[PDB]
Write an enzyme that holds these catalytic residues in place. Structure first.
Site, short mmCIF file in Angstrom:
data_model
loop_
_atom_site.label_atom_id
_atom_site.label_comp_id
_atom_site.label_asym_id
_atom_site.label_seq_id
_atom_site.Cartn_x
_atom_site.Cartn_y
_atom_site.Cartn_z
N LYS A 1 0.86 -1.22 0.00
CA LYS A 1 0.00 0.00 0.00
C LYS A 1 0.89 1.25 0.00
O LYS A 1 0.78 2.05 -0.96
CB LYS A 1 -0.94 -0.01 1.21
CG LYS A 1 -1.86 1.21 1.31
CD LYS A 1 -2.51 1.36 2.65
CE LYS A 1 -3.26 2.67 2.80
NZ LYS A 1 -3.87 2.81 4.14
N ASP B 1 -6.50 -0.85 0.44
CA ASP B 1 -6.71 -1.16 1.88
C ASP B 1 -8.20 -1.49 2.07
O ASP B 1 -8.91 -1.62 1.06
CB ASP B 1 -6.20 -0.02 2.77
CG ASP B 1 -7.09 1.22 2.82
OD1 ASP B 1 -8.10 1.26 2.09
OD2 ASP B 1 -6.76 2.13 3.59
C1 LIG Z 1 -3.76 7.78 5.79
C2 LIG Z 1 -3.45 8.93 5.03
C3 LIG Z 1 -3.71 8.96 3.64
C4 LIG Z 1 -4.29 7.82 3.00
C5 LIG Z 1 -4.58 7.80 1.55
N1 LIG Z 1 -4.32 8.89 0.64
C6 LIG Z 1 -4.97 8.90 -0.66
C7 LIG Z 1 -4.25 7.94 -1.61
C8 LIG Z 1 -4.51 8.14 -3.10
C9 LIG Z 1 -4.70 9.59 -3.55
C10 LIG Z 1 -5.59 10.37 -2.59
C11 LIG Z 1 -5.03 10.33 -1.18
N2 LIG Z 1 -5.13 6.68 1.03
C12 LIG Z 1 -5.40 5.63 1.79
C13 LIG Z 1 -6.02 4.45 1.05
C14 LIG Z 1 -5.71 3.99 -0.37
C15 LIG Z 1 -7.11 4.44 0.00
N3 LIG Z 1 -5.17 5.58 3.11
C16 LIG Z 1 -4.60 6.68 3.76
C17 LIG Z 1 -4.33 6.66 5.17
#
Ligand SMILES: c1ccc2c(NC3CCCCC3)nc(C3CC3)nc2c1
Ligand SMILES: c1ccc2c(NC3CCCCC3)nc(C3CC3)nc2c1
Ligand SMILES: c1ccc2c(NC3CCCCC3)nc(C3CC3)nc2c1
Ligand code: NI
Lengths: 311, 313, 310
Positions: B242, B261
């Site tokens: 991830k 995730d």
């Molecule tokens: C904490 C902080 C940020 C994120 C995050 N950022 C997204 C990622 C792709 C572009 C938009 C921003 N993504 C995700 C998951 C993939 C959905 N979990 C996080 C957990």
């Protein structure tokens, strides 16, 4: 220049039909992907072609108000047999109140959605107008389909009347769509690949089925026999067949299945296929699921969920 | 010298340069604090202040114009952003890439996107510092945005060079690799609030310096294809599939990369009717949901996810 | 006969419990499928029956206001300490909702979003009897109807208490009253249908086989697993109705009733599928919410149920 009527403008040209809003809500039926011939030309005033006549429709809590545009006859209100046409077209002999209740008793999910979306019933459409309308519907949306059916009618069907800057044409007969330059013209009108299916299907119903009497036979034939008959036509698969069956051949149990019904069934009913995997077999299984849940009017229940999931 | 303040539109009218950026190509309040970069804050309403390389910026926008200002320092004379500094923004916001070209393509293959996208126009991907992104995202695991925003600041304060003060806010650059590889890094990190991950920060930093050498390698991965890069970063401690996908999409110009995730898995199932074509979350099932979104959306699949993520949020 | 009080009408007859609106919202609790015995006769003024007394309730941002009616029996007066302590226990105000919401939000991202607009959703502690028979009437049934069924059940078998305006109030029947030979026919005449069979049969079954209303109190002491099994042995009590009673009357906060609706929520919002080829699957879904939410999983469920009905 004749103009689109309103209820306050010459109330001397309107006849009424006793109709609760709980039974029929025009704004959730007429432009909600059944017919594509109804436009709110002025607020709460829906205008469209039925048979060879133009209508304008409006309603209160208690009554359905309607007037007809026939240069022809003297300006007058709808006749008795013309009011009988609208009654049948809206299938008002059938109580939506009782069907809503019957569906609510077995489906917890329909109970919640139906509260907000009363008066959603099935129109009883001309088979021909319904068939070609839904051949135009493949990988398409209600706005684009509305456009393709209007252009199709103006280019092939006879001129009835003009009201403001709106010219109204009746739906063309099979022979007008079956001709040697029909596909080429329908492509200029922007139907793309759907042009081949429209002409081809018009030809097939004439030469191979004996013209529009065939569609009346299907209206009387059992659902499964009609569905298989429709599926022999160019550009007519399970979905388009079930659409025509539900909306034009009096098969209330007909449940059109595509990827969007799949989405609703899965998300809102937790439905998965009890097979392997959308396939023809699994789409048929999904149709059976809803018939088994809602009963012989499953298609009318689908019209309430579809019309709701569109807002 | 003179006490410097956070500049608003009325405050500093001659200290704002403008880049013509359609609000439909960039909505700043949907990018800058949407779990991409954690270094941008709305110090005054509609006004976004944060660090790029070793310079503080403030940004805001109208409908046609992206307004921006630079706090070079107390030292340098108070001037408006230079042409080279307005290219650095253009590259950071990857404004070469057309969002209307993409939003339209996604809408043409994805019915669900079309209904969501209409109210969330201007969502694009920031081209972050591979170093900043990596070390920001090693502390991301199992934490919300607000917590990581704090972590990265207290981190940047302790290990980072002091750049300038604006109002009561002390702006520091992002630490270099050496600073994080020191023996006491783990103690300060562990004190700061970072868990066992402190070791993974120190390790991955020490490891990046041990083998690769430093930030030369992270530019090799930025030119290297997605296949090599994802596997390369997965060698580093604390770096799963991830975090590797996040860093790949956000720093190493892998628009196709889709970090997966439980939340992605949630959307995939509810909105797309997705179930794994395998066992009844897992490494291979997560890799399958990634393939699924790539095969649906195109080579800018990560950017499509960013719209829905920023829509859901 | 007498009239329904408002807080501004006869202020003298209203006692007050300190309770922030965040720890209890009557409009989300009193007619949300726990109790079917409270109606909002006047805006922010809910009236209903507890034990063998009628109450009206209202609240401000920090105060739960209440007033009681003991009948024409005695002289009109305000609630006693005992009656206030009764009302305290009914709303289980010892239990911090702030702390439970905090925990649920920390372990469940979906709850965090849904909870925001639905604070003050807590769980009533009902009399076992009233609860058992109210949720026997619940099968293939909606709140509005169940309210009617229970009201007519109470009018017909309920000890008469008082009339306030048009409304006449009744205490909940005892077992003896509901275990009568012509009780089913009466309940069938009041439109309960098949449920009438279950009410009489259970009422009779408890008295004779299990030994009086004492038996129900012994389940409030007993663990969840024994309590749930005991209830399922009753006519027209399956896994779901048993879990309802356990959660809302038997002080088992971990009890999570599972039906086709919980299935759909679980599937849509948590991506839940059974790891099976429904009774065993219903039980598995119960353990899932217990494993996710913890030992107050039923209360968490109540927040989502009361949300998914607005
Ligand atoms: C904490 C902080 C940020 C994120 C995050 N950022 C997204 C990622 C792709 C572009 C938009 C921003 N993504 C995700 C998951 C993939 C959905 N979990 C996080 C957990
Ligand atoms: C374009 C125009 C109309 C429709 C449509 N209409 C429904 C058909 C069943 C009765 C109610 C109206 N349905 C569907 C799917 C079956 C759900 N797709 C369409 C695509
Ligand atoms: C009719 C009347 C009430 C309910 C009901 N009440 C819930 C019970 C769990 C705590 C809050 C209230 N729950 C359910 C489903 C199990 C969720 N069905 C009902 C059918
Ligand atoms: Ni599923």
């Amino acid at each position: 220049h004749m103009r689109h009527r309103t209820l306050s403008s010459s109330p001397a040209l309107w006849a009424s039909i006793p109709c609760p809003r709980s039974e029929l809500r025009l704004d959730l039926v007429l432009a909600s992907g059944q017919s594509f011939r109804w436009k709110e030309q002025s607020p709460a005033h829906w205008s469209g072609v039925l048979a060879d006549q133009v209508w304008t429709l409006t309603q209160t809590e208690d009554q359905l108000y309607c007037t007809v545009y026939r240069d022809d006859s003297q300006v007058s209100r709808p006749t008795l047999e013309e009011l009988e046409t609208l009654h049948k077209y809206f299938q008002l002999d059938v109580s939506l109140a009782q069907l809503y209740s019957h569906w609510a008793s077995v489906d917890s999910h329909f109970q919640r959605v139906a509260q907000k979306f009363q008066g959603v019933r099935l129109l009883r459409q001309d088979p021909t107008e319904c068939l070609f309308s839904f051949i135009c519907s493949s990988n398409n949306n209600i706005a684009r389909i509305t456009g393709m059916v209007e252009r199709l009618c103006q280019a092939f069907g006879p001129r009835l009347i003009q009201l403001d800057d709106v010219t109204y044409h009746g739906f063309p007969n099979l022979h007008a769509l079956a001709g040697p330059e029909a596909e080429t013209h329908l492509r200029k009108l922007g139907l793309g690949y759907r042009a081949r299916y429209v002409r081809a299907s018009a030809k097939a119903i004439l030469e191979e089925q004996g013209g529009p009497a065939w569609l009346q036979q299907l209206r009387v034939a059992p659902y499964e026999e009609a569905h298989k008959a429709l599926c022999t036509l160019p550009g007519v698969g399970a979905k388009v067949a079930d659409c025509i069956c539900l909306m034009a051949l009096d098969k209330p149990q007909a449940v059109p299945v595509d990827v969007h019904v799949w989405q609703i069934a899965h998300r809102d009913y937790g439905w998965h296929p009890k097979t392997s995997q959308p396939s023809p077999l699994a789409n048929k299984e999904l149709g059976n699921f809803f018939r088994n849940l809602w009963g012989p009017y499953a298609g009318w229940a689908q019209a309430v969920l579809f019309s709701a999931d569109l807002r």
